[PDB]
Amino acid sequence: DSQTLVVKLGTSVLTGGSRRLNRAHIVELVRQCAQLHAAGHRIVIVTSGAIAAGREHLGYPELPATIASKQLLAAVGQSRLIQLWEQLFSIYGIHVGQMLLTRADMEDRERFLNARDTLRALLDNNIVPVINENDAVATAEIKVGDNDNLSALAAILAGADKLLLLTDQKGLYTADPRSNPQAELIKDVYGIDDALRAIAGGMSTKLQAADVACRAGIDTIIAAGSKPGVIGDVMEGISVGTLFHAQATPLENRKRWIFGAPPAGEITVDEGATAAILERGSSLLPKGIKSVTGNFSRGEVIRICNLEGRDIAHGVSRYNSDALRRIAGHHSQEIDAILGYEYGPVAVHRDDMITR
Amino acid sequence: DSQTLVVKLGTSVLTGGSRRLNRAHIVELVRQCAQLHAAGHRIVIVTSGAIAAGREHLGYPELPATIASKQLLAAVGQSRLIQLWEQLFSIYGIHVGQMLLTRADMEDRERFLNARDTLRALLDNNIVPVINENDAVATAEIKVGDNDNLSALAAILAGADKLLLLTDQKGLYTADPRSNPQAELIKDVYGIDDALRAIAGGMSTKLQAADVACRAGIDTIIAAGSKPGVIGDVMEGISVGTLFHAQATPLENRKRWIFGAPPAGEITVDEGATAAILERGSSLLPKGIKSVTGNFSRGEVIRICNLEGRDIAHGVSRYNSDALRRIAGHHSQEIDAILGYEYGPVAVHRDDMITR
Amino acid sequence: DSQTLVVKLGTSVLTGGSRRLNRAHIVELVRQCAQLHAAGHRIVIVTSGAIAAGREHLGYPELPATIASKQLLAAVGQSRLIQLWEQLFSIYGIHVGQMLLTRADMEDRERFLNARDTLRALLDNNIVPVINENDAVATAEIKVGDNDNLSALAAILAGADKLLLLTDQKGLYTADPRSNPQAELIKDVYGIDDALRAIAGGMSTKLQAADVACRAGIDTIIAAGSKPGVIGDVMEGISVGTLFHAQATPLENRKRWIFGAPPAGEITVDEGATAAILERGSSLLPKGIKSVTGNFSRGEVIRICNLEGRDIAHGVSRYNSDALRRIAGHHSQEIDAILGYEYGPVAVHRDDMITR
Amino acid sequence: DSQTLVVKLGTSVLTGGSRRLNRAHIVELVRQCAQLHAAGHRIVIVTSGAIAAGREHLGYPELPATIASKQLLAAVGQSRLIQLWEQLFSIYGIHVGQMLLTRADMEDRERFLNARDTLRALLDNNIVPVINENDAVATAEIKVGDNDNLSALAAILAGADKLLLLTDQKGLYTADPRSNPQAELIKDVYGIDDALRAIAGGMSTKLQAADVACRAGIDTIIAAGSKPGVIGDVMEGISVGTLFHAQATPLENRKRWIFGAPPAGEITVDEGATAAILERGSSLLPKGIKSVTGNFSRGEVIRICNLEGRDIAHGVSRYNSDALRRIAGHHSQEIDAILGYEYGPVAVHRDDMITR
Amino acid sequence: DSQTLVVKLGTSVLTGGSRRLNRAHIVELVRQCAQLHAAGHRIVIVTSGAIAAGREHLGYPELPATIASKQLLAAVGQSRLIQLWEQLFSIYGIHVGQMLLTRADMEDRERFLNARDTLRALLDNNIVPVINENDAVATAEIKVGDNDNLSALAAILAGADKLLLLTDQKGLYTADPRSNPQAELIKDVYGIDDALRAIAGGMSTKLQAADVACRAGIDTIIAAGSKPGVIGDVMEGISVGTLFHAQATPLENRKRWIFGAPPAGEITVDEGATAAILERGSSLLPKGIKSVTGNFSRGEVIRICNLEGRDIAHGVSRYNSDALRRIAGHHSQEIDAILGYEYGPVAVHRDDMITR
Ligand code: PRO
Ligand code: PRO
Ligand code: PRO
Ligand code: PRO
Ligand code: PRO
């Protein structure tokens, strides 16, 4: 059925090795993405090339060879890059959204929940998210990587099924193709070991991204951007590059997410909502909450118990402690009236909750 | 001579109170800003209206009344808003750079230094920075404020001389103008008092922003965006609204910045660089550094001591501890060869240093 | 038993804060009102949203930001708003009548009596009156208030027992709920004081309306429109928001109405009608009138004296001086033949008369 | 060129003598009106039949034979009447606005200005105003007249060129057509004499309306509603009924309007605006006003002088005294900033001024 | 995840036993359906009550007691019924489509495919299909059943997961509830036995519909329309009436559909498309077709073999034999050029194929 694919396109794929973005290759890839999008799939694009767009837009000026010059070029050219993406996608009647994320945002619980919420909102409305790194405050991908770890983090955030990394090479080779005439492309890989890290070598960052994505239960595909119909075959299942299989299930990833750290808060729930959670496996509404203990923000993991005090679930909170205390015992429609804002009608969602 | 002005435009000023952005008012304001820019002044723009631009771009769809819907609209419309700013400013031959900042970024030392570096790079290249909140990860300004506190933070980050906030009203009135025919506009304010807070009230967020900016040594002017030539009059010195005077000097703000927290590390400096720092008050080059103690990141405040151990200065570090250790004792031209990147030829700048 | 409730719905409640009217919320409120109506209660609705309905009907055109544009939108959308109310109420088999009133109409005695007669005729025929401001001639509520004072005037005109105002917030808080976690909702209020005005602040117009209604002997409840079953709970007596108790009895309000101004005229009454007025306290028929002095219109307060000249009552006149002179001494069944119209068989009603 | 026609349709024309509104005749008349509207003319419709619509909608119930029953029927059926008008006009792609006016509103200066403003706004946007009497507060037209004087007042308010009254008779006859075989239809009338009032006689109210309209400089045409193409021929100039010629010019009417009463206020104007008013005959902007004397509301006649004190003009004021004092000496764009609302950029319009 | 529910509402549920449709009950049920629709489910409504709407619209005339009178009433009132459904659903911002189906249409292969195509198109675009019987040509449901078998056929056509029949009774009872105090509602039923038909008895048609639906692999729920939240509980899984479990899987139903009759035609397929069909299970494009044998229409079952003549699949054809012959061997984008119309890019869909 419907699937989620995260396509990562580097600077070499977008420019083709030249000093300018090659719009013909990008329009071919956009055509493939639109073909997939029309069939009901969800597409997330992690892009680079803001520095190239800024350099072209400014007339290729002479700047100091420092990080600040790259930050300036990225700041000037992020607008041009997103404008190009929107213009190319509007040919096929598709809208494009812009998200600027950093690793620190992914590490923060509240920021992670906010980013996941806006990404889900974009995906539910048939809008393609285009994701880059915020180069104003973070300079990690400028120095090394070129949005490689950002792609893995975006795949984890989007709940993707596949992560396709497009590069200039065809994939992973057992030996050097030039030196060894018998060197062959590796078809499937089950776990990254020291031998693969040694044979791989520019390909180290992609290997780290693949390891991170596969440890979270996402299948990674390293392929060549110039191969015709690469995105469509990746979605269908045809082998086009190197395939790294998921080393875990999504349930294991959710277990690690919930139980990685001790709960930040403690909430008590009446009998009816306890029965709804246990027997029916449904979400937790603010009506059933009786007491709120602890000082925690939105997105933190809290412990849900019954009136007797027995732990019954662990789940992430969609509201911080103060809002939960203020809206406890009320109906959903009143939440906005109580707070002036609304995150949704549930306090703890069922997909973010693990029953103990 | 040349000064720095930060102009804050809310959604009410941009849309004129209507459904969509009014480009005539924005083009008049851009004309005034370009007139100031051509005279050698530096202009920073803090703006809103990404949600309105996104709603107009998407055809005004029907969406749930949640925060995620506003995040989606902001993501879709940030590109359109920056496109509008770029197109309006290019009429006068001015380039525009986009920066997305949050309060957490300003609080963090490393992110603050990165953002200040990119803003300075933009300003020294005759590029107008356009600053908005990163709505994907932060929702503080969506709920309340409309980029009011962000304006003060950007004024502090840019080292601005004036912070002008454009609103619907003409300024601050002692009494209600409708009820009291004798009510008059307050011209000058020296400090924020409880009586001023009570009589202010929509203006509470502007009052907080003015207090924050004035405590940092920046004059804050609340004026009406519809006043003809308001920006030029503000920059020249003509009374146009309510003016809040700085309650501190920039030197006091630098002292509070440096000495607010204990130093994160310590670095020893040879006799030549000690004489340069003390007698001449110059920046600290990496060649003179002899040792590095502790683990600190870029942007943290460290203690500069001499060979005898007598503390001589306190200053923020342009490199983290590891890079400082690697490039200690080397010439500046080799920095990029040693690290793979360069932040500049100085380890601690003279304007970031306080001599003890 | 049967009671009169006046429900005031603002534009925020009707549209949900969005661009267009939200018919689901209005249908829920109409369901509650119909449930009350079927039980024998009388319901009066004061509404807004003519401008929003007109803007939606016209295709959201681009208009000058003047008062005349809002007047045009209200003129276009009043018909659509009344159509929506009629269609929603006819689901439950209830008819809807439209009344357009201004403050000047309420101030005038004759127009007040005409409007009260219309409202009473509507209420005795199981027809729900829907009251809005006549935006063609009056602009007071367009600028500020949103039919808040008009709600109090309609409650006074209808002889209502309760005036419920639906807003976005839950009611009145002693402290700011966001800033102070210990802030709590005020349940009951006995009189409007300066402390209440200071802590209230958007709610100032509601405070003025509550003061006006309570000075006339009507209990005013400020509640949230999104609260489930708020109308039924209000009518039963359950606390749902902030309650302001009546500071006068309806008898005191009638005394203030009758004796606020000097009588406009004097009429002499024979012995039989004098005995009916004094001993039995019945209405004054035109047959008993012997003379009419002065020139007054319908709805003015006049002095009823006996043949000996001793003043015996003060009451409002259902006919002007000329009609009273023409129909004096005649039977009530022939009023229409003499005048060409009939206001009823009584000259002064017993509930509009105070016996001296 | 373009003209303004006010069509008055009574209950007999709309119903055809039956108990229900005849939609075929109304659709024919609407077709003629739409033909005129498409050619660039401005059409204003003064209508009746709210009581008939209310009677039909309620199932023809049994009600007391009083004025309050007629007010109830009008309140219920005004919505139905305006809905019918809108539905019939939307066949030809024309929108319809609703205005409820009374004679007291026309007699009041501020209410007259508000009504004229909303009518002009409706006419400028290609919207047909449909005008009836507010039967909730006024009962004059219910008793006698059937919107006859209201039509003359609406023609005066709209600045119409022609007022066409449609009835069942063909016009005015010299003698009784049935008794006298030589009785002929009067083609033209120049002033109403006692002989005309005697020969006319149900036709007295139409004669009063024609006299009122022609005394204000508007040509009146009394014709039969069933005559094919009566509206088009009236606009073209073909004789179809009785024609009453204007007894005055519009300039005389404006002179009477300005100088009917002593000025309510006094304003002083600087030299530049004085020169603009005198030699150029332009409107008066708030920038040129120096002082404001007196307490007057919007729509009142005030005296405009120069700094020397010599009277230079008399004109109606678009703002009341307090607003004029608050916006005196400012620019137009700031008006909305100062007052919170705007009536337009001119304090006194050029078409409302008489130069002394 | 997302599910498909077919709700069947009889005349008794819509009218409540009276002579008119009860819009309050229908609006409650529509509110529940809209709540389900907003959550991503697909809702199909099989309705009755066209005769009641026609009787009400015509004023309840006197007609002969024949079938033709019922056909007349249904023809007049189908428009009114669909208008009522659309008006009630537009409160929640949902569109409604109208389909008139008969049993003969379901028995015909081409008509079945056309109806399934339009139903799928309506469901994919978030439009609620409202289904009734075409009473102009078919009179089966008029005589007996009241859209009971039509509901089962619509559930089979829509590929629904649940079929909920709403009636006035609470469900199926073991004995007569009034005669036997111990009579209890049957909770679950696994297959219809002669004992069930004997105990059931007006409930025979519902039993036949449940048997037909469950033999095709659809769970049936017989419940009471007046029970609050019956639709939501049915979707969730809460027991609210009598539950008839599916006696077969959807795969068995597809096997019966394909292999019920001998194939109507024969088509040969090249090697590439044969490989795509066999080991990948993909749809059959017109490019791979080599030869077409037989005379069959669209929707018939045909046999797909390879060039060697070995049978490889059986599937229903989306094009008739002539169109398939004309578009054989071409690309998909030129189907419209060749034929002048298009049914889609696949000759045989993958979900309609059984691989031999
Ligand atoms: O967009 C760019 O070009 C830089 C490099 C990767 C992250 N930001
Ligand atoms: O751009 C906007 O509209 C929102 C509000 C301020 C920050 N982001
Ligand atoms: O109906 C409206 O929208 C305006 C505001 C209140 C009075 N008229
Ligand atoms: O509309 C009607 O029928 C009444 C009579 C004229 C004025 N109002
Ligand atoms: O709609 C109706 O009322 C008839 C009876 C069921 C099928 N058609």
From Swiss-Prot, chains A, B, C, D, E:
Instruction: Please give the activity regulation comment for this entry.
Output: Interaction with gamma-glutamyl phosphate reductase (proA) seems necessary for kinase activity. Requires free Mg(2+). Inhibited by proline and ADP.
One biological process term from GO is: proline biosynthetic process
Q: Which UniProt keywords apply?
A: Amino-acid biosynthesis, ATP-binding, Cytoplasm, Kinase, Nucleotide-binding, Proline biosynthesis, Transferase
The protein's matches in CDD domains, at most eight in alphabetical order, are given as: AAK_G5K_ProB, PUA_G5K
Among SUPFAM superfamilies, the record links this protein to: Carbamate kinase-like (SSF53633), PUA domain-like (SSF88697)
Q: What is its EC number?
A: 2.7.2.11
Q: What is its main location?
A: cytoplasm
Name all PUA domain ranges: 264-342
- Quick check: keyword Nucleotide-binding in the entry? yes
Give the matching InterPro entries.
AceGlu_kinase-like_sf (IPR036393), Asp/Glu/Uridylate_kinase (IPR001048), G5K_ProB (IPR041739), Glu/AcGlu_kinase (IPR001057), Glu_5kinase (IPR011529), Glu_5kinase/COase_Synthase (IPR005715), Glutamate_5-kinase_CS (IPR019797), PUA (IPR002478)
Q: What is the recorded name of this protein?
A: Glutamate 5-kinase
